[PDB]
Design a protein around this ligand. Structure first.
Ligand code: NA
Ligand code: NA
Ligand code: NA
Ligand code: NA
Lengths: 307, 307, 307, 307, 307
């Protein structure tokens, strides 16, 4: 086989699309293998820039096509390099930018722990014709974390495995196993803005909706509950415009549903309080002392739903 | 004719545009036919990478252009492969990404059952010069369904048919029939988020609008109805920003129209109740006992409109 | 001159941009002319696929450049074909997708009748060197109309005319007239969603704003009118997010302006009713019986503005 | 030097981006110069289509690169033409589409008067090697103005000037002056939709906020003022979604600020009216007769801010 | 080594993406080095336009690839120039447009001071084979500042440094140091629109929420506080649509949180005032005189949070 050493430099990770489960990765890829010796002009190694590699390819130089498995479409290739040492080894350097797909479980959204995966594999050559010797990912771009949306934690996990394709045994007797490189970069979301601007106003609004049982008349309680329901709808429409459009509920979504249920239960209990009188001579006083049990029940509901 | 075996690998299906009735499909396409034998260098088969296939094409190698019938514009072709076995058979491998168009009936939106169709056909060669032998679509990318917007159900349906073009008989005597491959991938929408965040708050809001007949004064009922109508407008504007912009009504749209009609009928009945008095000495009491018939009538309306 | 027969196939029409007055058309274009006879390899006609037409062009084969006059920018050309019959005639087949511009009067928006125009003309050759013999547009893609945003009505109108350019007489003595093909495809908008979700809630909201004169106190009428004005602003912001951003008013826009004027006139008449008393001893009763003339006046205003 | 006559045809002007201060222009550019005579095949002039001009360029034909100075990025070049007359003169025709940048003062937004500028200049050749003889811009596409967002007024102003670059004197002794063509196309915005849907509802809402001093109780005036402030916030959010995102205030922005100040001053004066009583025995009657001076003061403020 | 003088012209800076921490820069880049003398045709220097530089590159002319380090993806290269003087020196001129990445601290958003950085470096050649002699950035495009979103202050700071790569010592003994050019362009945001349309209505709304303690009844104070909370939610949703989507709080965000806390504290103090009575015979008068201490406490909170 042919041994290839891979070095991957990460410049930035951005553009996390939540519905598409994709994200953009910009950086360099370095590939280095060894072939038959050639006589470069002079003792110095010969460097081939962009748009001159194809001349060497047409002349007969061997170079493999290293695609990304999880990239969506084609990467945006910048400058590309091919440096030909006279002892025999060839170094390929290129710059890429593309949308890379992964699973990215977005449940528990403000406190996510999702890793970014770059999968690399030769497009054509199997384990018997092309092996990956080692990969050292240099994700050295680590900076201050308070201005970063994604907190890159730890170091990039690198692994080399063999991938066997079951359909390729129809045309190939024993050589259908491909060498693959997988890169794991674990990241944590910056939770400060969401916690300070979405979770806390939800708590204040839900306590405001708790505050309806301190009124003295049934009519005032009813119109107060309707205005509170309008407030919750307005805040739901406010948070829908900012939060990602993932196809399932997050903590903020369940908190909004909980506030909806709190207002509906408040309406039901105040109506049942008003009409518990036998002939209209009783007062709605015994059951309306749930002002110190409605928030405790809501806190129990929250403690159940968080855990 | 020339026999071509097609293998299609599906990597991901995403980007379902509802107004345009299109969707994105990313994956590989494998084509395999047989020609005259050639002497490859050595006993091993010769592999042609990207941007070297055109040299073989200009030299005289025959390769057909397999377009997608329902793709919109041009697919985003990634790496492409041409592997030339010495016994005679040629394997073409390429990666595509493009927007594929279909019918995609979006009535009954949260509980959709819509299939994704990939239609393939040679661009130039008819049934007498190019036949498709068989297709085996490997849509093996099946994962956990609770984090997927689209639930890919079952297995991909594959069929090979002959398509006859009526206009081509003006220039061709008897050979105007083209071979086509059609692929069906049935999917079901993930209904949990819509059911938990849109259907249930609609029910709570509609029950809140039912709650106006439990008030005691005509004026309070009127201002309560106006605040409720504002709530329904706010929630309609909330759901318009999230739901797709399809050109017809879904279940949520008819539920919003039903809430509009409920509030308008409530206004009409409370006004007619207030002025049913002959000289202002009667009380609005007989007709205002529709507090237990307005929701039953609405439930009958819902049972009629759902079925 | 040289005679060219054109066949245009329409696959889909979509992406109607209202502010830009453009729309996307995807389909095929077929051109067929006749030249000097050539000896194709064998008795069968020779077919030239994509990226091999340029070799024949450089070798000396004549082929004209048929641009679209009203396309914006460049069309997205898919696969292209050139089939060379041995008797002499050449058939050019290509697939296009681009944004085509037209007038598209969007007044009376829900009940529009706007035609989609494709204009075709040789880029270089005039009437004396290139004539269009006939065009038969095959817009055969006609389906069920209840799931289509645009109802394609009738058949495509085809016409061939000569276009004379006045500036080209400065360099050319008598040959400055170009042959042009114009295609008309008339379409009608699907009006069901707009009529059921925008026109009807406007009528319900305007009748609700009519309902303020049935109150009994001046203060209640004032706060009711202010809440109704907030409702109209909310619904205006709701319909602005969905309706197209054309630079002039549609029926919904004039209906919103009419509701604005209704609420303002209601405020003015209730204030003038309250202060028509000489010393505060009169009652606001004679002029407040406009509860059955304010909607009739609004209906007259609507009947005037619709016609 | 070499004389070049330029003819520019404007097809459409659209896509005015206000924050970026750019706009899209689609049309043709014609360039015509004269060189040494050549023997075309036959007496007829030889026409070079697209993708064959580069063959003539490589063979030795001289053609200059005419860039647009104010275009952003690269124009989207459609079909290009090169027609070679046998007497010696060469005509270059090409189609362009790109984003052109200008100043475009967007103060006084509904009644704007902004011109669209296309600047043209050779990329390489100075005044001593390439001169522009004359330009005649054919902006003949003039149509009915009631369906056009931008009213193209008058005729295109054309001027040819010499541009001297001060840095190029470091490498060039006396030849650093470049010939430039500047085109002015003055346009007026269509003000009907903004005036009918934004200015008039602002006036109605501001008169509604004027209407609070006709109430009889301090509490009713306070809650009415708070509901009016909510109405103004809602309308501000309504107009923010539609109006352009220019970095400074327009007439609508100052009108919204004026309404904000009107409601705040109303709150301050009603509170100061309620507590001007010495011991609560006086009535808030002398200062509350500003119902006919608050709108006059606002009209004076408007007359000052408009002029 | 080889000395290269760089001249960079800035045409416009726009498109500041806050979440991506990128921005667009359009302009020219001039590179000038010296090589072996060549015999140009005639005494005049020979100019190579676009799409003819590759012919000289294939023939053997040396030209380096100067990439931008911080550009995202590939720049949109317009026309490119190569002018070959006969004494030996070569001038390379090209036009670029791309998204350049930087840190761009967006804390204290309306009064930002952020610099735009362009980093330039040869793609292949180190300090021993390619040195940058000097750079003179001509950012001469300075205009009136009242219509500019970004106020370009001062002059562009230029610096040339050597960058040493630690990984390249594995293949290179002593030559792993690269020459880099860094350009600083400091800019100040235009703060007038934000200060006049966001900060001032926040102050008016917060003073309106201060105004609740001047009411006379506990119920009126409660419903007034709920309407005020709805107003704050509406204004929060209004400012979320316009302000950038940076992942942390700005001054407007903390002001909105402060208004939320003010309304919640007002609700808590009025409820505690109502129920401080021993048997309902006391009046809520001693603690309700915080009408002149609630705004002073808020002003102290603002003075603490601003500093
Ligand atoms: Na609202
Ligand atoms: Na919105
Ligand atoms: Na929006
Ligand atoms: Na209210």
């Amino acid at each position: 086989p042919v041994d290839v050493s891979v070095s991957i430099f990460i410049n930035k990770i951005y553009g996390v699309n939540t519905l598409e489960q994709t994200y953009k990765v910009d950086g360099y890829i370095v590939a280095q293998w060894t072939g038959k010796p050639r006589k470069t002009p002079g003792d110095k190694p010969l460097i081939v820039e962009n748009t001159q590699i194809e001349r060497w390819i047409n002349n007969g130089l061997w170079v493999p096509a290293l695609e990304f498995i999880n990239v969506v479409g084609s990467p945006d290739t910048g400058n590309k390099r091919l440096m030909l040492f006279p002892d025999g080894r060839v170094i390929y350097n290129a710059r890429f930018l593309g949308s890379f797909s992964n699973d990215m479980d977005f449940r528990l959204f403000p406190f996510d722990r999702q890793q970014f995966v770059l999968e690399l594999e030769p497009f054509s050559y199997n384990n018997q014709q092309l092996r990956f010797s080692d990969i050292q990912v240099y994700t050295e771009n680590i900076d201050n974390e308070e201005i970063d949306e994604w907190w890159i934690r730890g170091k990039a996990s690198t692994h080399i495995s063999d991938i066997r394709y079951d359909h390729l045994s129809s045309v190939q007797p024993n050589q259908n196993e491909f060498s693959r490189i997988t890169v794991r970069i674990d990241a944590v979301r910056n939770p400060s803005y969401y916690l300070w601007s979405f979770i806390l106003p939800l708590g204040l609004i839900i306590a405001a909706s708790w505050s309806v049982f301190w009124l003295e008349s049934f009519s005032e309680r009813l119109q107060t509950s309707f205005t509170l329901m309008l407030t919750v709808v307005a805040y739901a429409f406010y948070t829908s415009n900012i939060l990602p459009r993932l196809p399932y509920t997050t903590v903020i979504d369940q908190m909004i549903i909980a506030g909806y249920g709190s207002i509906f239960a408040a309406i039901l209990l105040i109506i049942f309080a008003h009409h518990r009188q036998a002939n209209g001579v009783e007062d709605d006083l015994l059951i309306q002392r749930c002002r110190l049990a409605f928030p405790l029940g809501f806190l129990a509901i929250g403690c159940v739903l968080v855990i």
